[PDB]
């Protein structure tokens, strides 16, 4: 397990998200579904010139899986997946500029719900999750697990759990007072409100 420090600007963003009073927390789900859609768009596009890129799975879709016993909401997609370099350095490089723009927008009157316009919507997960685990698999690369409970650090390891084929699984370990996001009616409501036109099937699993 390797441990890394967030860039200071990203740590500052995470602290703002965790500490600012803001009731409209449900927007986290739109942001993660949007990221999944983006990753699905990319594998679809690349498959048009190299069909073998779908050897790791032809189905392009998103599953939402609540588990009340583990207190997790999991978002699974079969998108392009992230590489080790994506997780450790490269996406963070991009996030630095988006965070700067977002911060300046907030100071100037914008609200947290506009976060995705700056390319850093992932971090809205910390509105509802005490810990986020991201399991991801890109073609021709290994399966990795990224994880953070904020506080300025994250970890990355090669994942020895169930093989995914290709794509990304975001496991939200929900805060104790945010368990509404495990309820079927609540998730359905949020998907219909904010993610109704996503161009891939979204299957909301039910609990056993
Ligand atoms: C908004 O920035 C993004 C958006 C998506 C990704 C991504 C992902 C990805 C990342 C997150 Br977090 C997520 O919730 C879902 C995803 O499928 N998998 O490959 C990618 N790789 C690419 C290039 O999309 C990475 C950065």
Swiss-Prot record:
<feature type="modified residue" description="N6-acetyllysine">
    <location>
        <position position="42"/>
    </location>
</feature>
<feature type="region of interest" description="Interaction with NR3C1">
    <location>
        <begin position="1"/>
        <end position="208"/>
    </location>
</feature>
<feature type="binding site">
    <location>
        <position position="96"/>
    </location>
    <ligand>
        <name>ATP</name>
    </ligand>
</feature>
<comment type="subunit">
    <text>Homodimer. Identified in NR3C1/GCR steroid receptor-chaperone complexes formed at least by NR3C1, HSP90AA1 and a variety of proteins containing TPR repeats such as FKBP4, FKBP5, PPID, PPP5C or STIP1. Forms a complex containing HSP90AA1, TSC1 and TSC2; TSC1 is required to recruit TCS2 to the complex. The closed form interacts (via the middle domain and TPR repeat-binding motif) with co-chaperone TSC1 (via C-terminus). Interacts with TOM34. Interacts with TERT; the interaction, together with PTGES3, is required for correct assembly and stabilization of the TERT holoenzyme complex.</text>
</comment>
<comment type="similarity">
    <text>Belongs to the heat shock protein 90 family.</text>
</comment>
<feature type="binding site">
    <location>
        <position position="122"/>
    </location>
    <ligand>
        <name>ATP</name>
    </ligand>
</feature>
<protein>
    <recommendedName>
        <fullName>Heat shock protein HSP 90-alpha</fullName>
    </recommendedName>
</protein>
<comment type="subunit">
    <text>(Microbial infection) Interacts with herpes simplex virus 1 protein US11; this interaction inhibits TBK1-induced interferon production.</text>
</comment>
<comment type="function">
    <text>Molecular chaperone that promotes the maturation, structural maintenance and proper regulation of specific target proteins involved for instance in cell cycle control and signal transduction. Undergoes a functional cycle that is linked to its ATPase activity which is essential for its chaperone activity. This cycle probably induces conformational changes in the client proteins, thereby causing their activation. Interacts dynamically with various co-chaperones that modulate its substrate recognition, ATPase cycle and chaperone function.</text>
</comment>
<comment type="function">
    <text>(Microbial infection) Seems to interfere with N.meningitidis NadA-mediated invasion of human cells. Decreasing HSP90 levels increases adhesion and entry of E.coli expressing NadA into human Chang cells; increasing its levels leads to decreased adhesion and invasion.</text>
</comment>
<feature type="binding site">
    <location>
        <position position="35"/>
    </location>
    <ligand>
        <name>ATP</name>
    </ligand>
</feature>
<feature type="modified residue" description="N6-acetyllysine">
    <location>
        <position position="68"/>
    </location>
</feature>
<feature type="binding site">
    <location>
        <position position="77"/>
    </location>
    <ligand>
        <name>ATP</name>
    </ligand>
</feature>
């Amino acid at each position: 397990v390797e441990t890394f420090a967030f860039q200071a600007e990203i740590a500052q963003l995470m602290s703002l998200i965790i500490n600012t009073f803001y009731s409209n927390k449900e927007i986290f789900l739109r942001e993660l579904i949007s990221n999944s859609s983006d990753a699905l768009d990319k594998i679809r596009y690349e498959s048009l010139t190299d069909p073998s890129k779908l050897d790791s799975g032809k189905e392009l879709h998103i599953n939402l899986i609540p588990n009340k016993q583990d207190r997790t909401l999991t978002i699974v997609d079969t998108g392009i997946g992230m590489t080790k370099a994506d997780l450790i350095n490269n996406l963070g490089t991009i996030a630095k500029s988006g965070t700067k723009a977002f911060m300046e927008a907030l100071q100037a009157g914008a609200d947290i719900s506009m976060i995705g316009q700056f390319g850093v919507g992932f971090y809205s997960a910390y509105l509802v999750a005490e810990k986020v685990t991201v399991i991801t698999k890109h073609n021709d690369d290994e399966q990795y697990a990224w994880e953070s409970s904020a506080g300025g650090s994250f970890t990355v390891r090669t994942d020895t759990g169930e093989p995914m084929g290709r794509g990304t699984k975001v496991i939200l370990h929900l805060k104790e007072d945010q368990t509404e996001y495990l309820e079927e009616r609540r998730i359905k409501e949020i998907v219909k409100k904010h993610s109704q036109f996503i161009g891939y099937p979204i299957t909301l699993f039910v609990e056993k």
